Amino acid sequence: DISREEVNEKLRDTADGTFLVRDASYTLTLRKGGNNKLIKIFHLTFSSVVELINHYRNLDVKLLYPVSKYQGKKLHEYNTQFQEKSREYDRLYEEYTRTSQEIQMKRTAIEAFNETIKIFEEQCQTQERYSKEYIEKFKREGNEKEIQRIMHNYDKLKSRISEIIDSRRRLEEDLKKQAAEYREIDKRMNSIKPDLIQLRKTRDQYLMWLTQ
Amino acid sequence: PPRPSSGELWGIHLMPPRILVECLLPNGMIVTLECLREATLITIKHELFKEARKYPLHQLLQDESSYIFVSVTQEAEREEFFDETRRLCDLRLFQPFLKVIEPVGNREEKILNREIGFAIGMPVCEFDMVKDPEVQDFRRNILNVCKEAVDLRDLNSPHSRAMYVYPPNVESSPELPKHIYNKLDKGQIIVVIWVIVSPNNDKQKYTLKINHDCVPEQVIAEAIRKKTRSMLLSSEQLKLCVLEYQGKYILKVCGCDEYFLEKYPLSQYKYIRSCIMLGRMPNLMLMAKESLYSQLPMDCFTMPSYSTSTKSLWVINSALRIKILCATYVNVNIRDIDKIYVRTGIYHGGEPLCDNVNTQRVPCSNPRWNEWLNYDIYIPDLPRAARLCLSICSVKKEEHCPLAWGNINLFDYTDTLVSGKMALNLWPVPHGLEDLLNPIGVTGSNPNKETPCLELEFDWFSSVVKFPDMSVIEEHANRENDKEQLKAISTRDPLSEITEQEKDFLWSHRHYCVTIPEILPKLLLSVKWNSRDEVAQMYCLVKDWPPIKPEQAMELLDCNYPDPMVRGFAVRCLEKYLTDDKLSQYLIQLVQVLKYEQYLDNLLVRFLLKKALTNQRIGHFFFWHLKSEMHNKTVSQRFGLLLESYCRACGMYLKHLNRQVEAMEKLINLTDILKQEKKDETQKVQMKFLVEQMRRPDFMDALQGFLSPLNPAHQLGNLRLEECRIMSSAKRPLWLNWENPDIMSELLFQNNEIIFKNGDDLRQDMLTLQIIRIMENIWQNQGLDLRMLPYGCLSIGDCVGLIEVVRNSHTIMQIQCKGGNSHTLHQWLKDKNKGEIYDAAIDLFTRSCAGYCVATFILGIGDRHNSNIMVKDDGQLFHIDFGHFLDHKVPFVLTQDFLIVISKGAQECTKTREFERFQEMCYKAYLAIRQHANLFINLFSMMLGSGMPELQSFDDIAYIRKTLALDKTEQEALEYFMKQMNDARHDWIF
Numbered sequence A: 001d002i003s004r005e006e007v008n009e010k011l012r013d014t015a016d017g018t019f020l021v022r023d024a025s026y027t028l029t030l031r032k033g034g035n036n037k038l039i040k041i042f043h044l045t046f047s048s049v050v051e052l053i054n055h056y057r058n059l060d061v062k063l064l065y066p067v068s069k070y071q072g073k074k075l076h077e078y079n080t081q082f083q084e085k086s087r088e089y090d091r092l093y094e095e096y097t098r099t100s101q102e103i104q105m106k107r108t109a110i111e112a113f114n115e116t117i118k119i120f121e122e123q124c125q126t127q128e129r130y131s132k133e134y135i136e137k138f139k140r141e142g143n144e145k146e147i148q149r150i151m152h153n154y155d156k157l158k159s160r161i162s163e164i165i166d167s168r169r170r171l172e173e174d175l176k177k178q179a180a181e182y183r184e185i186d187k188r189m190n191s192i193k194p195d196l197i198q199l200r201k202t203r204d205q206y207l208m209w210l211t212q
Numbered sequence B: 001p002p003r004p005s006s007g008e009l010w011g012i013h014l015m016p017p018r019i020l021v022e023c024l025l026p027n028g029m030i031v032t033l034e035c036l037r038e039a040t041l042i043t044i045k046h047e048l049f050k051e052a053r054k055y056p057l058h059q060l061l062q063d064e065s066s067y068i069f070v071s072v073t074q075e076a077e078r079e080e081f082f083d084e085t086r087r088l089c090d091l092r093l094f095q096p097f098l099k100v101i102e103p104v105g106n107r108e109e110k111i112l113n114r115e116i117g118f119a120i121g122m123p124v125c126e127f128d129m130v131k132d133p134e135v136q137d138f139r140r141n142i143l144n145v146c147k148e149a150v151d152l153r154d155l156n157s158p159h160s161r162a163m164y165v166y167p168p169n170v171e172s173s174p175e176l177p178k179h180i181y182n183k184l185d186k187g188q189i190i191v192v193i194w195v196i197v198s199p200n201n202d203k204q205k206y207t208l209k210i211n212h213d214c215v216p217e218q219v220i221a222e223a224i225r226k227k228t229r230s231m232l233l234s235s236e237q238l239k240l241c242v243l244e245y246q247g248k249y250i251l252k253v254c255g256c257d258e259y260f261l262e263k264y265p266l267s268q269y270k271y272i273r274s275c276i277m278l279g280r281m282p283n284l285m286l287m288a289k290e291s292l293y294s295q296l297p298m299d300c301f302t303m304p305s306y307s308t309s310t311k312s313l314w315v316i317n318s319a320l321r322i323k324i325l326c327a328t329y330v331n332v333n334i335r336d337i338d339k340i341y342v343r344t345g346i347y348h349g350g351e352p353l354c355d356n357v358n359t360q361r362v363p364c365s366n367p368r369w370n371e372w373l374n375y376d377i378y379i380p381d382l383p384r385a386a387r388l389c390l391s392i393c394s395v396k397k398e399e400h401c402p403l404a405w406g407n408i409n410l411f412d413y414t415d416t417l418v419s420g421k422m423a424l425n426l427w428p429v430p431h432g433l434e435d436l437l438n439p440i441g442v443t444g445s446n447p448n449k450e451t452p453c454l455e456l457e458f459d460w461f462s463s464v465v466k467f468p469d470m471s472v473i474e475e476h477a478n479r480e481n482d483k484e485q486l487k488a489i490s491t492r493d494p495l496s497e498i499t500e501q502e503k504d505f506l507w508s509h510r511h512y513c514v515t516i517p518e519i520l521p522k523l524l525l526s527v528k529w530n531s532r533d534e535v536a537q538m539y540c541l542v543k544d545w546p547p548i549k550p551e552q553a554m555e556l557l558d559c560n561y562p563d564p565m566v567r568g569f570a571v572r573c574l575e576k577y578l579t580d581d582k583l584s585q586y587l588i589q590l591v592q593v594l595k596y597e598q599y600l601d602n603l604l605v606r607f608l609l610k611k612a613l614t615n616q617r618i619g620h621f622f623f624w625h626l627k628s629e630m631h632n633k634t635v636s637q638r639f640g641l642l643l644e645s646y647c648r649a650c651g652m653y654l655k656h657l658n659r660q661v662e663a664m665e666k667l668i669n670l671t672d673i674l675k676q677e678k679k680d681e682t683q684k685v686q687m688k689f690l691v692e693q694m695r696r697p698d699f700m701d702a703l704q705g706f707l708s709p710l711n712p713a714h715q716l717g718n719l720r721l722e723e724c725r726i727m728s729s730a731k732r733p734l735w736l737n738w739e740n741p742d743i744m745s746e747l748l749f750q751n752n753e754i755i756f757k758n759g760d761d762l763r764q765d766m767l768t769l770q771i772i773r774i775m776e777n778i779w780q781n782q783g784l785d786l787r788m789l790p791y792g793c794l795s796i797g798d799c800v801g802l803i804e805v806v807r808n809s810h811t812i813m814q815i816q817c818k819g820g821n822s823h824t825l826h827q828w829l830k831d832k833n834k835g836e837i838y839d840a841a842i843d844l845f846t847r848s849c850a851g852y853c854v855a856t857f858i859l860g861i862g863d864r865h866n867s868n869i870m871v872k873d874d875g876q877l878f879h880i881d882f883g884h885f886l887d888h889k890v891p892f893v894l895t896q897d898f899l900i901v902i903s904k905g906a907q908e909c910t911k912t913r914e915f916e917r918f919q920e921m922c923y924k925a926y927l928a929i930r931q932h933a934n935l936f937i938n939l940f941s942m943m944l945g946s947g948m949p950e951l952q953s954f955d956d957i958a959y960i961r962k963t964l965a966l967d968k969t970e971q972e973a974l975e976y977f978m979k980q981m982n983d984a985r986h987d988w989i990f
Ligand SMILES: Cc1ccccc1[C@@H]1NC(=O)c2cc(NC3COC3)cc(NC(=O)c3csc4ccccc34)c21
Pocket: B763, B764, B765, B767, B768, B858, B859, B860, B861, B886, B889, B940, B948, B950, B951, B956, B957, B958, B959, B960
């Protein structure tokens, strides 16, 4: 009298037209379209269900492939080797989620540095525009002590840009360091997840009340 | 892009007391000024221009009034700080610097644009630079809904504006249950109206005893009559006065912003109906019409800046074909995984329209297929909601596992079939999905262009192939004692199996079905959608279909019904029949179902945005619900573009929302610091840190005098700091307290208490609580008087939320700790409520206990720890923290403890006079939900889209059927439930 969550488990990556019998509150499920059909059996031209099923096998659709029934302590070893992989994976996905956000952060902080530098470069164009007339006045008057204050300031302004530019350029490198680290976390995830698929179908086991 | 933390600078949570800000002057110079973090831009600009005259080129600098500050934010955008009242700490700068400039262009446009951006949490100028026709059309077109709604608000402008802002908080039905009539004194309620009559709060009562079914105007009229009694006028001179001055006044709930602005009966207002049930005295305040109407911002919504041969699909004589060329990126071991292939399939929502078809295997290193794939479907036989799903897959053959997935719409928003070359940036596979394809997930390319990109190509035909208009389709398209069979499926739940026999049976009688409207959902899951012929017939049926309950229309908006004619019918059933009340209570589901829609512009959003901009109470939660899911990258663009369209038109509530958003940011940041850098420190040290920061002027201003996100009727005034604290949990939640600035807080809410939690997903609680409300509503309106307490809970973003504090309530654990025994729980409830209240408070205990045993069971939230059940002093029992349970993973929580209280007598009670009732309550309660199974199934079904670990497939929801025992006869299900009731009889810290 299997569940509706157990029909779908057994039709997964099966060829269309696989078939099996179930108890109702019997029900002949099937795989066609990539779906799960129901054709219920009322328990009738034929003098049996046994006689009936055998004809079709040979949009009424053929019963190509059957499900069979058949396929203690040496399963209690494998569940131990399902508790290791599942911890190791979640730990990777933890590290994957962090790194994913932290990269996205670095990528904003670059855009920001770009717009910051753009502002400061405009300041150099501003200062060279206005300073021009006052630099000439001071040349005429021969006042070096005052041309020094204009140049000193420009020395801090142009100096400050360089400091920001390496700050940007240092982060751009650290981004490529983090990105690579990110590709290798995802390489190590995708090469564990399949293992954890076909060491789950293993979980299906004989039914006894006692635990472990 | 949004900023990733709530820090004051990039990298730094809190600026230290004094910051060196590098100032860029407009003459060219650089000056490095020491500023206080809390300092305003006015004081910074004043101290800057003072110190700027000690530097060269000072003669060039104009009056500081002529200039404004410009800097880069953490959202990597150039913000112009026009509002110079703002503090330094509140600017959200990237690096500590400011640029002095002269402002430019249109002033109000630029300020409004920032305001729209802050609330949303994304800059507006980012939408302006998006190179997408559907996106840019949505932006231009959606403003039509906004134009409607603004034109609707301002018809009969004085009253209709006030209605927008203070909508009546009223039930759906005037008719009130018979068990509520009997609360009333011979058809009548005793009410108190209050009046303020002088500069000082000189208060005057008016205790009236009036018909429950009176309108607010009539309740006012009785007030006027009582004042006029002392005066000596004719009976027909009373009348004259009363009549004219009925409509110069408005009633308002004492203690909160709830107005009686509409001609509804007094009983239909939730606040009164609550007073009737609880058996409390209503206190309303009388208040002048013009004295409200003047407070109303005289608002006006002006428009923003932003405003080939074809053949029909059925003329093309071929099978659908797609070419998979090659992929750019594969992230793989190249040792453990040998080869990779692109699995494909055409889907209609979740069901596939034809066999899946794969590529050949290739080595990971060179991912290039360059192969036409053949789908087992005719091009005309494609439905409208048809789309390609695909994914790149790995192999060990033995082990298949998906690497990156992506879905593409096979028709444009302009109903054009896709053609030519197309690249698709794929998505990472969700957490616990091992399906080769993910037909569920969003449709389209990844905004993150640093991901596996799959190139592909679709066939080019003579012309641009379009999907035909409806009229052409309408043309093409055009048994007894099995009605027992039809009605008998139309009652069964939406998740029940419908055999191919029962499908063929329904399709055959389709034309009959028009008689039994509620069958449409069952009927649709019988249609072959891969038949141009069957489809077109259904379309004719749906067009001439009778209307249905909203509750039932909502089914047709979930994943299983992606057809636009099916959804358009549903939306139309809501447009007409769904009440604002009802809307508000299913707003969680309606927002979440926006995801399943194929295009940005559609009938559902246009419906929602209208209602959101027509009614501010819906608008408020509409905003939050959407905003909360903004961090989620799959939906951020849509919800962003939506929240943009709302914020544009919503009026002055944008300013109220900004203050909320700002208040939450501070709290996020404050928690973040305690969670990270101050994590180790003792409770004393942290509490010392907290009160210091909470007293600062930047904090006090931002978190005083704003409206609660939980409820916009509740104002939050001055902080009671001495009563604020950090809670015991390892996530460090904040118990906050507010004075209530409402004139007469004494009567209703002296103190607004809210919990602020950072780091825990509160959506589960949010969905659970919603459902407990609806269970109570179903019981209450059917005559079953069971009292639940679905307290307030709101998610405001990624594991950040607020919780209403139910006052004067203690956990069972609390009560136990003091003494202990079975009788002590009773003794507490007796100790608190004695005499003629003891009888009413036990009657409350019974009913609450019963409801949270039936609801607890049906939801499977039974076997709850004692710490998670609370009792109010008046005797109301309720469950808390539904998250804490669904994370960790006896049917009922019924205890010999509570049974002593309900029976209220001898300890050795197997059954009692009182007990038997309590039991009959449960059975009627349980059976009431069983008969409304369909609604709860559909509520849960619509929340599969939403990322929740517990609700990812229909297989998860099927537990509800087992509890309700839907398969079994009704009589049987009583027996089934009665088992569980019996069955749930019988070192506590560990
Ligand atoms: C999906 C659903 C719908 C309705 C009832 C149950 C379920 C879950 N499916 C199950 O199989 C299951 C099992 C248990 N407990 C075990 C039974 O023996 C202990 C509890 C729950 N409850 C919830 O998950 C749930 C309650 S309100 C809420 C809000 C959002 C997300 C999930 C929830 C369910």
